[PDB]
Symmetry: D2
């Protein structure tokens, strides 16, 4: 049974006294339950957000043009283009939980030192030689690099070359706004440290596999790894595929290599509200259909193939971004070898025990 | 500095080419960051919900009248009156995270066996001899009793007497709706077990202080205590006040006794999304002003006194309910001995490391 | 295969040069592996301690006589009689991990305020009106009461009546000695607070089922419950048996009711090194045979029946105590209703992932 | 005050009746507390084990000679030379908790596939081209490499060259024997997989910094990293020293670089009972004196310098090994740059809340 076909027993006699009680409800800020239980409590998630794809060539065109018409600054903070879900009523929200944005930084430009409670990351698909300084620690950016900017950490963005750089912001702005959890402070209009060191202190303490500095024995809520570089991400994915060739367990599913970016102090997610993963599918691979609670977003990093969402196949190229709202059945099909970057609100669904998963063949 | 007075550097020249790019934004579901950073990222939480009080005598009048005009049933599920925040745009939400409701159950009436992912509790200020059956386990209800109804547990409500009963629902419906996390199923139109045992199985395994059944060694995400009875709550609060008389640490603050309802398997909160507490202030007590992230709601259980919210003192009687949205400075003043029941979304703010606290004298 | 029948390939030619190398080993503090792998690394635990029973009437006789011949004091600290395992080479160790002792306190006598790192508890089978003061907090003692005395907490013992009292100490002295973990300090020769309050502060904050004081929100490594009283222990066990009569899950095994004493801040064990449980078997009940890693000890609190250890049935009366060393197969058989108190080193085996369990019918 | 000078009040009158009660004690396996509280409960740890150094050139000489006189085999399992503490009564125990051993494996020799509950690691100071197969996964060994062999994992050792190899075993045999926690099984006399792959599967899934395979989302009690290679260990230590040159936090103490080997699924220790660290001191560095609960052991990997234990300076060269029993004050002084490998029983002291630390300048 469901909400579209269950017997509605309460439906009250439309008398003067009834309408007067309803007038009374309006006055006293009361809304009766009966007239809407179903809206409030669906059979399964039925998101206001809608599955949607953004074409990279489109995003690029509008990003370059923004580069012409407007400087990056101080009220607006970033020349960034936020992907707004058609189903979310004009809000700059790619899902109810996440903001997803393309930030363009033109030659020699800078962004200034700020912090907010909202958790953030920067993912670079094309570009080079911009540097984000986090809590004073300059973190070089380049193709394939995930940089983190966990909540309440100072950060600003200096471009060291005559080249523009395009990256994606991901944040829990939509969660943080709706739940009243936001704080924000100012730092400097120049980035705090103009130095351009090829690797960051955080990297240099923390990017040694299976090793922990004795000066860093305390666990952290977010990750101290300022950058997860393309190289390591690439090699991990390749080994998983080589291991598969060799008949050893590694891949998540046949032909489907994948890793999660993690906080090394805990082995858990990079930040309290956001999970990041990277996936490499072999040419020909088609993932089982999944329904998962919460929203995820992917960007095609390399290769060619397709998503299916609610049964609708959309063809996908390098750079394209799509969102799968809560519970929408989704799968991915690689034409060539298909490299994809992923973020979701899953750590929220998981901390609060709201997660569920339906997979096709089980 | 803040968002009302920082220099806005980006403000682009209003040319034809600019307006064309903006037209282009609308078409492609893009919203640029610059025109609204401040809305998105405030200096501190600035909730859409508003501090509000509901007068019990008012809620009672409208609840009784609902008892006349409408039966409790099957589409509408409950004859319950939801406290809607004036600041939340018509939604039946007392805060962005919580639903708060007054449910009236008339003589001999029943509610039927359902379950949903949404977490729930039932708190009885006046009434007797209704019974909620949880996963088949009948749980008697009476003045002062917190009953839990954790997510995904079957539940229905049979009234064993010619008396009406009034209680409050509290749920994370507003969280669960906005985050797309809701599921819902049907059970029976009679409650599953008409038996009326004076205490429930859960109570009888789990309400022995400092003792755990060896058949219940596994930890749970929600509490197995079906009911936290007035008696124990009352005695705890009294002892804390006696201990204070005796010069021993106990009270949270001078004259301010208080306890948190807990999951005994973990010592943590009753449910993943909701904290419940009970407070007893001595006559004359005035709490330090607090700002806390997330929303809380209180109901005056006994006595007389006042709240101050944003500096506005409101006088309060037995049964009244008020909400303090995220970050609104609040304090409480007891005229007589002031007993109050409390719920909040704090376990969410805390799991996700979003919590902060400003207290007056420190 | 095993160590008694595997081929020994290394066995070196007994030449002058070999004996010279062995002489050399002795000199340099070297012991070669080859000559003893099997001693060092058995097929399954093969404890030096031996299953043993102590007859209460025996312990009582020797305790009273100790009462005549010797006062309780200041070097010797306690007039206590420690159960020494025949297999543990003269040490006052009931198992390799635990000390088990019967302490006699005669009329009007006191013990003085000390503390040590070693974790301790006091369990009273017969007696009344002695009081242990813990960190200044007087904790009354009587038949059935478990008192805790966690490591590094000051404690002393005043007897308020013309009656002697007999209880059992349990401690991790044998663990703490062998692992070099012991510290010890002095407090007073009178107990710190001669007052005799019928319940202790700790009880009065913490013994309210499912409730936590807001002044005690921090988790603890040991339990803040100073006393787990007979009443609650008794009622818990009875309810589990009533629930069984009623066809509801409760008992661990058919006719076998049981509870674990717990730290309410965590739901975990009372102390880092020691687990305490209480068991009530129905007349006729015979438990499945178990092998568990680590040692346990039981005292018959009420009733009559038997243990089987390595196949040897021993008949048991009120007060008797037996130990089951690591991995010895054991079971219990109730003739009448059989009440038993239990402690083990299981939290150690469990924290370090050394635990295993073999049960007969599975 | 202490146990050498506190008043001994109990000392009973030596009468016939007293001696008869004592005779009675012996018969009934009772040992009275009074006559020995102080032995049992010292003021601070006073270990039976003694600070001791083993000279590498000595260990090497006896290891080579063992290579002549005896083959590695099947009863004796390993041609390994265990460092026995003079203070531990003939047992092959370097401390009460740990076994420390030097294993010699001659040309073309193998060890066979076994497993035991006891946790183990292999650390190579000099040697190359031996391979330990763990649960079928061949793990190459070379200078500076820590290999893990967590409890209950099959393992055997094949030497692929005409060269001998010398390494150290470290195990919790002494803990496991004394606490009755040991199990042991047989596998094959050839290692299971003669293949010699330059890196192991475990490495290849798990040695990518800040990355986790989605096929390995479950946490583990021991580490899945089969090998922590010299390279990464070396670079980590160097960066910490470069960071210090650059005025950035990194080192534990001035001139004192250091890392802990960790389980990447948790950020915690490599195994439940054993901590491993590596330290690199700058020439001239002298560490503050420490007292720590539990025993540690170090091996000088490179450089030259000294330890001080109970005030006794001993000079130290490449390969030397020393043990610091529980609570012995210790410090380290580098003459040249001083590289050292370290293991301890600290995870035990820490899980059970027995740890304490006294440091000189605080
Ligand atoms: O700092 C950033 O790059 C940033 C970018 C956004 O699109 C939104 C919020 C931010 O703080
Ligand atoms: O079952 C209830 O009593 C209930 C009451 C509400 O006001 C909202 C949702 C519910 O499930
Ligand atoms: O304080 C006690 O009652 C005690 C009794 C013992 O048998 C051994 C150590 C102790 O500290
Ligand atoms: O497998 C080994 O290399 C080993 C070595 C030892 O010295 C002691 C126990 C072992 O299992």
């Amino acid at each position: 049974l469901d909400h579209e076909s269950v017997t509605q027993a309460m439906q009250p006699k439309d008398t003067p006294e009834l309408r007067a009680l309803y007038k009374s409800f309006e006055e006293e800020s009361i809304i009766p339950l009966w007239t809407q239980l179903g809206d409030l409590m669906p059979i399964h998630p039925k998101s206001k957000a809608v599955p949607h794809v953004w074409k990279w060539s489109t995003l690029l065109r509008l990003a370059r043009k923004s580069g012409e018409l407007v400087p990056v600054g101080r009220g607006g903070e970033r020349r960034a283009l936020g992907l707004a879900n058609p189903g979310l009523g004009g809000n700059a929200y790619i899902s109810p939980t996440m903001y997803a944005g393309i930030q363009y930084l033109g030659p020699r430009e800078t962004a200034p030192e700020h912090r907010h409670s909202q958790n953030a990351f920067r993912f670079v698909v094309e570009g080079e030689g911009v540097w984000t300084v986090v809590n004073g620690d300059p973190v070089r950016m380049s193709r394939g690099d995930l940089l983190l900017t966990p909540g309440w950490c100072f950060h600003g963005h200096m471009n060291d070359t005559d080249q523009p750089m395009a990256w994606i912001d991901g944040l829990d702005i939509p969660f943080s706004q709706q739940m009243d959890v936001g704080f924000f402070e100012f730092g400097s209009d120049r980035v705090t440290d103009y130095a351009t060191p090829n690797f960051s202190r955080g990297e240099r303490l923390w990017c040694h596999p299976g090793l922990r500095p004795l000066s860093g024995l305390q666990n952290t809520v977010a990750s101290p790894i300022g950058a997860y570089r393309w190289e390591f991400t690439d090699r991990a994915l390749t080994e998983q595929l080589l291991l598969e060739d060799e008949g050893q367990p590694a891949t998540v599913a046949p032909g489907h290599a994948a890793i999660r970016y993690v906080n090394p102090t805990t082995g858990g997610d990079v930040m309290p509200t956001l999970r990041c993963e990277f996936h490499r599918l072999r040419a020909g691979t088609e993932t089982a259909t999944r329904n998962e609670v919460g929203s995820t977003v992917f960007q095609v990093f390399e290769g060619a193939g397709a998503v299916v969402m609610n049964g609708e196949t959309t063809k996908l190229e390098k750079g394209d971004m799509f969102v799968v709202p809560s519970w929408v059945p989704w799968s991915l099909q690689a034409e060539t070898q298909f490299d994809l970057f992923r973020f979701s609100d899953a750590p929220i669904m998981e901390a609060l025990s709201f997660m569920r998963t339906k997979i096709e063949g089980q």
